[model samples]
Target chain A: KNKRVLVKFSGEALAGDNQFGIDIHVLDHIAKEIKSLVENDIEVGIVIGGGNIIIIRRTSGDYMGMLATVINAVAMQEALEHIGLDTRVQSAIEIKEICESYIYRKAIRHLEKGRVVIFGAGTGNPFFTTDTAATLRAIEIGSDLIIKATKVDGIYDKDPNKFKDAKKLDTLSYNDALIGDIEVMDDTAISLAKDNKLPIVVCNMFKKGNLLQVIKHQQGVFSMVK
Target chain B: KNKRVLVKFSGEALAGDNQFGIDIHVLDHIAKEIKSLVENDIEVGIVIGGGNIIIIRRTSGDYMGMLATVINAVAMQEALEHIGLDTRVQSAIEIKEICESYIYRKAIRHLEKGRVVIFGAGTGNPFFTTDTAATLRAIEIGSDLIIKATKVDGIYDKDPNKFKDAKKLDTLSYNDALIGDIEVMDDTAISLAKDNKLPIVVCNMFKKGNLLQVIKHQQGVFSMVK
Candidate 1:
């Protein structure tokens, strides 16, 4: 469990209490958790969504949304650095002044050197979602597992927020997730995960210590979508 | 000039009357001018500074400054797209969702297809400035010339704002600009241009028709630093 893992979180998680932009407290907490992973000698790569700051589908088109991810990535990089961890931000868009551009070899090198790498800007394309971006990066870096940090404990049969009788799926195949219309992630992301045979661990990030718990493979309330 | 050219502008120029962020009218005017170049079959590449939105030195450190450039670049890209000129943004930093990464081959391909390509984020390094980014991109794209769009009409021997009598050099050698420490651009940018024997045209973007005049090789009050 203390191996190479790619962690995925939405911008909403980054936002924390705020409706937009970044929340300092949330950022600090996230950075601390990631640092714990690094301290344990586990290599980590991160993929963050831009929905908290800007939703490309809702405003200013996809181009603006993509820029939003860069903003979040840079903020995250700063926070990680503030906590005394060496971190690098690589974007699919290529803004070289602030961080490194996405190079598969360089990323692997960073991880090998025990540095944290954050992948920003979703796949550099307009039509793709951040989930697909996370999966793509996970495969590119040969990550052992895709740890998805969400608001809920795991994937549920129905809308867990609205339905009291909803049941969480402890384990489900990729085909099952796709056919059942369970929205763990988008179809493209799921399909890529299926093709690559990458296992996804869905768990709640808001709960303190849950990230570490899931990563260590300890008994935790989570779902496994393989 | 219906040939390939790389144009550079400070973010402040894009801001116009506004103290920070983008000015809509100014952006529109700039877009219209760029459209004119595209209409004349001139392939244009742009490199913009982030001082208007977020100066790297003053705020969230150099890293944040680099992200600011991406934001400015995206705004410019949207403005261009609004006017129907096919465009692409290639950042040195690599935020893929909003734009393409800096690939020399792809940039050349876009130019060959008569699309305007905007290069954002400086060299992807913290110590470098936007001027250096412009020179580097120009050399990579094999640009005909480097068009430095500034607030003033041309490069003057003394500060025109303070000096009652300042001399503008219609034509000057790169060695003179470098040796004399002319305020045309940063030393790195000028040195790179001198080393590569690339010509730089410094002119005022605020003056209507100045961009076209310089490109057309017509009578213009701009200085040529070769």
Candidate 2:
């Protein structure tokens, strides 16, 4: 059984109906799911998507996008703590007032202590998407699997939004998934995961009990890309 | 003559007439003066105030204010680099993507190598003013003096902007200056300087040749709180 995981949540997922800043209800739901993993003794590290704050960056530089990630990370930290979980936020960019910088040793220590560590700022560079950041952080933190929680249940052979005949794949090889050209994740993220042999699971974050099933390797409710 | 000095600049100073964000003309002028200090072999470490971006934080938490400081610091870093000076930005908050995290040893090393170090994010904690952060950093870096660069040339017995009879105070004991109730700097900052036996010079940043005068102890152009 894999004892460690890196869960990637899109920043848009935290926006809920507002599609703006963080929505408290959305945060609470995710925190509850994470608590389930902590109860089972799984060490968790989170990488948050900054797209919810992307509009801010559109008018500014990529650094603004990095700053947005820290904001979401801190909001997540606050939410996690509200539910009685010990959490730490580490940013690729240093916002010492908000959280810790991405120090490899410090992140490991936080995980060892059973604290949820949220990785922010996306690989600490411009042009690298959050997907790559999640994969990079997952490999660095020795996460056995990276679960990308999407709005949909799993990766579809075709756009599920466009056609009812589209089918969901329960499992896919890194090679097959790479050529599929799905919106599941960026090619760079998959390439790194492929090279590192880190399995990626795409699941619906809104579906209750879905994360538990994915983490325990049970119930087959999601798609796994090996 | 001071060999090393820590300088504090208000974010508003960077805004110039726009009073919103960084002004290139203002930045260029300040960088030229900083270059003057470097030419005189004065090791410089800077602490920047974030009032320029305070309006953005009006609806947000103090954390937003901290983020604003990093933005200002980075802009200042870019300006310094544009003018051919080697500069490094170290944040109290870890924004590794943008710059280095505040490390005592590394900051000293940067100074030794003739790199200008700008400290941002205001002590890496909220509920602390930038003045205090500046004083604290000045002491931590073992700076020979801390200069508060302001719009006004020196500390006056009364508000120089509102009064015609006010006279500039060239030098005042820390004991005498503490009771003056001047806004040149916060009491906490002066107290820290007073306790540490660090002299503080109040100088006009926009005044031609003022900083060099303050650092070289020349022209009686600034106020000294000793």
Per-residue lDDT of B91-145 in model 1, one digit per residue for the tens?
7766555567889889989999988898877787767888988998988888889
Worst 10 residues of 2 chain B by lDDT: B53-62
User: In lDDT terms, how accurate is model 1?
Assistant: 0.81
Task: Give the per-residue lDDT digits (tens) of candidate 2, residues A1-226.
Answer: 2488999988889888865556778988899999998888889999988666441132235676677677778777877887889999888766554678889999998999999999988887877888899999999999979999988889899999888888999888988878876656878888999999999999898787788778875564789899
What fraction of the real A-B contacts shows up in model 2?
A: 0.27
Residue B9: error of model 2 in Å? 3.1
DockQ values, each candidate: 0.18, 0.14
Best prediction by lDDT: 2
- Model 1 spans with C-alpha error above 4 angstroms: A53-67, A92-97, A101-106, A122-126, A163-165, B1-60, B85-119, B122-226
The alpha-carbon lDDT assigned to residue A108 of candidate 2 equals 91
Please give the TM-score that candidate 2 achieves against the real structure: 0.61
- lDDT per residue as tens, model 1, A1-226: 3489999999888777656557878988888888878887889999998776441123345666666677777788888888889989898866555567899899999999998999987787777888889999999999888988988999999989877988899999998888885788888999999999999889887676666677775456789898
